[PDB]
RNA sequence: GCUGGGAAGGCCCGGCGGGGAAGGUGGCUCGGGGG
RNA sequence: UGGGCCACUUUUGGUAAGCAGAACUGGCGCUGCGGGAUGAACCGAACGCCGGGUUAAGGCGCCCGAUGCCGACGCUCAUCA
RNA sequence: GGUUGGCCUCGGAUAGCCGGUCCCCCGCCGGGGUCCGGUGCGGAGUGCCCUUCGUCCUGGGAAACGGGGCGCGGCCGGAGAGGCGGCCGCCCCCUCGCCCGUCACGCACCGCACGUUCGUGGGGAACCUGGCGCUAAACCAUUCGUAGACGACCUGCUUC
């Protein structure tokens, strides 16, 4: 009935110049564009859901093609709204540029 | 071309830094980046206060260069700025903005069926008008 | 975001609407700049124009049919502006290349649309008044450029349409002040509710 | 939000005519707490509703223990006659305070969504 | 926009196919059958106002004669030839003048 | 270093690659720039090489 | 908590005063204006 | 092992040298890592396999992590800046 | 495999702008000059539009010169990449859909994720079901010699 999550573009890895930290991610959350914006997202869950070829459970539904890597914002990066955020497993590389839902589920408001 | 002066009586508009969102007059003037500003009935003391934050408004208080704050205090409740600024439109301005910003989610429901019924009214006057206006003939 | 997103070229700074670009093509989005020719570069036209004629001079002195491409249009002039802020040899500065398109004028698909305008790089701002600067499209007319004529003529072909139908938006928008003139006793009650909220001063 | 429970869960109504939610349990982190509130004082919320009550009831395989003949009976879970009565029994008189304050009916049928232009960490809720 | 005149010669047509020998010589068949019903010449009519509208610079599409040649050729030579001098309506008025 | 005489270079660029040509019967690649006080006429015409 | 037991500052038309001026108020004079 | 080489500073021959020869300490050789785009020696720092936090030197338009600060004050127009 | 409402457009100035309005000129609309407003842009992109729980009794307002047809037919505009819009005529439906209320109901699946759209998505093979339509070339081989290392290229081959 409604969108219900926040529109995050995976933006990157933590990274130096010549190093990359993959096991953390840089999101850019739509309307954030401060870093005092942002704290109202640590700690929410965000979830980088793509399709793929096999059908897989969905809790609560029919098998689908829609497949999904959790994970968490954990803290905010840099001066102008990018977060940091640790998911389960490491995200693909072919996810930069790409569509992160940010859920609002564990909420503080 | 120019309307609004920076000159000693002018009263300003702080837009941002520790005290934006309030009124000022300017005492005295130094450097060509700063000025002598206070607002005694604003709650703003006297200080220094860079012209990049500022906002000149209309209003114009009669006192002499760098008075103490008793004679800004005096022109400023004679003329009666807090009053004046408020019946603005760039109060109004302010004021609307700030009463958006902390509408809340009943309030931004009502807000929906009002102007849905609203809008779907003028609109129909509108056609209405169009129709009256497309009724010509005449050569 | 997740729509395209047009921009207006007149008025800018060329690299500092093409960082800009870069970034966000990186970002996912798709750009569309439009009116490449009205693009700004600071420092007076002669000296733009000298940087050109060096770019000019560089060539493969083996094959120049090989050598670097000098581009004479002011969009591809853009375009290689922001592949140069662009990781354009991998697959992902190639894939933010393939979303950002560039056009002199402005073509049928995007004259019927709303152009967005970055004030980060606008030469208003950016940019001191007593400052000289050189118009892309004068610069590319003579380093090589063979449609400034055409774009002319096409785009004051384009402002007429554009000024016809902005005055019927003008016409609209004062039946729209009349009629909510008219429909005011059955109005006053939801206009309340809106300059409560501050909605509509 | 009428009370919180032993457990921490929330007990929630809102009532089954309007959004089709009945008496439900809820956890406080997955919900958002808006500013709009109606006086539920004076209003009486049944003693039994406890955690135990809202318990989910299930019975599966006591002397099935090989699965070649399916197990898919009593899957549907059925509303107890009790459960309606509760309901009625709290919507009785959660409903006249809510027709009290106006339009409140109306924005307790429709459901919360973002719209492209709204951002959460911008909204008073 | 491309319009042909109805009663295209075979010389002409020859330049159309690799293999005249073989071929049908079905060549603009359909396509001259537009110069006689009514709805394939109100097309025509739309396609001459349209060049009038919107064309810059119009040329005609002419070919030689190969069976006047003492050549082993049949084929002919097409070629584009602009039309100078005068409005956009003056050249196509010209031109349709000397269709065939 | 450099050639011990100055002599001319052998040729032109201006005619290159020197290829057969895509085409046989040779395309006019530029017509005469129109101008419309001048009556209508044909610009061009085809002819074959008798002797 | 300390400091110059902070410096400034606010209110008490601060009151009896004294002195100094200028980025000179009023007035006065001159030169330009609005009924 | 008994071919060394480099840098700050002192220092001899030489017009000088990425030259030749000394003193002192450190380094490279034997050494990876962050930075200097690149680089035996410079700057930071020396290393088991990892998670979190914070830094150094260095940076924060875009490539490319980070100023998308409503940063402060000036100086500067270059037809080889 | 992405995506999870739309914005359908003045030109522009920046030591200035925007809107509106009476007189003069240009074939009943625009351009000027007065005059009146607004300008930290409110005729505001910090904006605007749309806004999704669905139905049943049931009142009041809005409307009622109204709303919907992958329903027909005609016309108009758009060429810079028109791939898009707009206006009529006929026919069929509902007086419903918009706001405030009355009234109860729907799996209320017993706290839980990938839910919610674009979408009747793109692509490729195959099957069935109806209608309207079409019956061609290219290459080789042969020939030419305006061509040529070979490829390639220029040509001819039952009609007057
Ligand atoms: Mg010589
Ligand atoms: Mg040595
Ligand atoms: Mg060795
Ligand atoms: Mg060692
Ligand atoms: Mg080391
Ligand atoms: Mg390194
Ligand atoms: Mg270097
Ligand atoms: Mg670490
Ligand atoms: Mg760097
Ligand atoms: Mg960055
Ligand atoms: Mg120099």
Redesign the pocket.
């Known amino acids: 009935?409604?969108?219900?999550?926040s529109?995050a573009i995976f933006?990157?890895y933590?990274?130096?110049?010549?190093?990359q930290?993959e096991?953390?991610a840089?999101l850019?959350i739509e309307g954030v564009?401060?870093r005092d914006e942002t704290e109202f997202y640590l700690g929410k869950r965000c979830?980088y859901?793509?399709?793929?070829?096999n059908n897989?459970?969905?809790?609560?539904?029919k098998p689908?093609?829609?497949?999904?890597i959790?994970g968490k914002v954990?803290?905010a990066?840099?001066?102008?709204?990018?977060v940091?955020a640790?998911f389960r497993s490491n995200l693909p590389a072919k996810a930069i540029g790409?569509?992160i839902?940010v859920?609002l589920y564990p909420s503080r408001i | 071309?120019?309307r609004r002066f920076v000159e000693?009586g002018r009263v300003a508009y702080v837009?941002?830094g520790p005290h934006?969102g309030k009124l000022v007059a300017i005492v005295?003037?130094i450097?060509?980046?700063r000025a002598l500003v206070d607002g005694?009935c604003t709650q703003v003391?006297?200080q220094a206060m860079?012209f990049?934050?500022?906002?000149?408004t209309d209003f114009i208080l009669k006192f002499?260069?760098?008075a103490?704050?008793?004679y800004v205090?005096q022109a400023w409740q004679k003329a009666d700025i807090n009053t004046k600024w408020a019946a603005?439109?760039?109060a109004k301005?302010?004021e609307?903005?700030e009463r958006?910003a902390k509408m809340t989610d009943f309030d931004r429901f009502?807000v929906?069926?009002?102007?849905?019924?609203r809008?779907?009214?003028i609109?129909?006057?509108v056609?209405?008008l169009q129709?009256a206006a497309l009724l010509?003939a005449?050569? | 975001e997740?729509?395209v997103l047009v921009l207006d070229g007149?008025?800018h700074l060329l690299?500092?609407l093409?960082?800009?670009v870069?970034?966000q093509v990186?970002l996912?989005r798709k750009v569309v700049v439009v009116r490449c020719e009205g693009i700004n570069i600071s420092?007076?036209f002669?000296?733009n124009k000298?940087k050109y004629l060096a770019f000019l001079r560089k060539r493969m002195n083996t094959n120049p049919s090989r050598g670097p491409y000098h581009f004479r249009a002011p969009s591809r002039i853009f375009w290689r502006t922001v592949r140069?802020?662009?990781?354009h040899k991998?697959k992902?500065?190639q894939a933010a290349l393939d979303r950002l398109k560039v056009?002199?004028?402005?073509?049928?698909?995007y004259?019927?649309?709303?152009?967005?305008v970055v004030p980060?790089a606008?030469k208003?701002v950016r940019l001191?008044?007593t400052?000289?600067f050189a118009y892309l499209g004068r610069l590319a007319h003579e380093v090589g450029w063979k449609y400034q004529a055409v774009?002319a003529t096409?785009?004051e072909?384009?402002?007429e349409?554009?000024?016809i139908?902005?005055?019927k938006?003008?016409?609209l928008?004062?039946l729209r002040?009349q009629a909510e003139k008219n429909?005011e006793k059955?109005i006053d009650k939801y206009t309340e509710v809106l300059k409560t909220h501050?909605?509509?001063? | 939000f009428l009370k919180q429970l032993a457990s921490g869960?929330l007990l929630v109504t809102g009532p089954?005519?309007?959004?089709?939610?009945?008496?439900?349990?809820?956890?406080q982190?997955?919900v958002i707490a808006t500013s709009t509130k109606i006086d539920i004082s004076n209003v009486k919320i049944p003693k039994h509703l406890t955690d135990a009550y809202?318990?989910?009831?299930?019975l599966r395989k006591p002397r099935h223990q090989e699965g070649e003949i399916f197990d898919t009976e009593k899957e549907?879970?059925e509303?107890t006659e009790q459960?309606?009565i509760d309901?009625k029994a709290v919507d009785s008189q959660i409903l006249p305070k809510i027709?009290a304050i106006?339009?409140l009916?109306?924005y307790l049928?429709?459901?919360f969504?973002?719209?492209?232009?709204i951002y959460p960490h911008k909204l008073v809720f | 926009k491309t319009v042909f005149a109805e009663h295209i010669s075979?010389e002409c047509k020859?330049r159309f196919?690799?293999?005249?020998?073989?071929?049908?010589?079905?060549?603009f068949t359909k396509y001259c059958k537009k110069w006689q019903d009514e709805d394939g010449k109100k097309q025509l009519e739309k396609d001459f106002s349209?060049m009038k509208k919107?064309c810059q610079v119009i040329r005609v599409i002419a070919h030689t004669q190969?069976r006047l040649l003492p050549?082993?050729?049949?084929?002919a030579?097409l070629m584009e030839i602009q039309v100078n001098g005068g409005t956009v309506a003056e050249k196509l008025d010209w031109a349709r003048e000397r269709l065939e | 270093s450099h050639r011990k005489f100055s002599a001319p270079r052998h040729g032109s660029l201006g005619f290159l690659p020197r290829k057969?040509s895509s085409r046989?019967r040779g395309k006019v690649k530029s017509f005469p720039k129109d101008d419309p006080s001048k009556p209508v006429h044909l610009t061009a015409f085809l002819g074959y090489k008798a002797g």
């Open positions: 009935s409604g969108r219900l999550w529109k933006a990157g933590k990274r130096g110049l010549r190093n930290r096991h953390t840089l850019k564009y401060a979830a859901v793509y399709k793929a070829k897989t459970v969905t809790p609560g539904g689908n093609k829609t497949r999904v959790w954990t803290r990066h840099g001066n102008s709204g990018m940091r640790k790409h569509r839902r859920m | 071309v120019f000693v837009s941002f934006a005295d003037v450097d060509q980046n005694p003391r006297r860079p990049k934050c500022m906002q000149l002499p260069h760098s103490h704050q008793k205090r603005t439109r760039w301005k302010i609307a903005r958006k009502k929906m069926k009002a102007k849905k019924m809008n779907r009214i609109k129909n006057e056609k209405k129709k010509k005449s050569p | 997740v729509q007149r008025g690299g500092r093409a960082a800009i870069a970034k990186l996912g420092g007076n002669y000296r000298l140069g802020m662009l990781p991998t992902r500065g056009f002199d004028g402005i073509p049928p698909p004259d019927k649309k709303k152009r967005m980060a606008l208003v001191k008044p400052r000289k774009t096409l785009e072909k384009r402002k349409k554009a000024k139908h902005y005055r938006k003008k016409q928008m004062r002040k429909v059955k501050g909605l509509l001063v | 869960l089954l005519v309007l959004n089709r939610v009945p008496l439900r349990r809820t956890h982190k997955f809202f318990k989910k009831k299930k549907k879970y509303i459960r309606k309901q027709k106006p339009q009916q109306g049928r429709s459901v969504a973002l719209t492209n232009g | 075979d020859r196919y690799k293999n005249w020998h073989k071929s049908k010589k079905k060549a349209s919107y190969m050549l082993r050729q049949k084929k030579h | 057969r046989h």
